[PDB]
């Protein structure tokens, strides 16, 4: 089993933590990469009802198992706050207009 699928993709909560920590390090300190400019806030106009405060900010989580390091995004994404909590893990995949869905 997979703790987060996101499409096909199968992300244990360890990629997910892992993810998280370099994307908040780069939130700490005011830092971006890629042409996105990851990690940007994350407007949440699907209105996933996160248990975890707003502001959000989004950064990728690779299907490869490695840290974004800028380069393609890909579909998936790790959601955080400033409290460096996860918010939850949503992906592109299977939704268009740049809109996301929930990783189940």
């Known amino acids: 089993a997979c703790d987060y699928t996101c499409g096909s993709n199968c992300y244990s909560s360890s990629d997910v933590s ?3 920590a370099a994307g908040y390090q780069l939130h700490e300190d005011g830092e ?24 959000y900010y989004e950064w990728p989580i690779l299907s490869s198992g490695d840290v974004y390091s800028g380069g393609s995004p890909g579909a998936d994404r790790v959601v955080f706050n400033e409290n460096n909590q996860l918010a939850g893990v949503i992906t592109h995949t299977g939704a268009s207009g740049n809109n996301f869905v929930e990783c189940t």
Do not use: I, L, M, R
């Open 18 to 20: 892992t993810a998280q």
């Open 32 to 55: 971006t990469v890629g042409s996105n400019s990851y990690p940007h806030k994350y407007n949440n106009y699907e209105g996933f009802d996160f248990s975890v405060s707003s502001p």
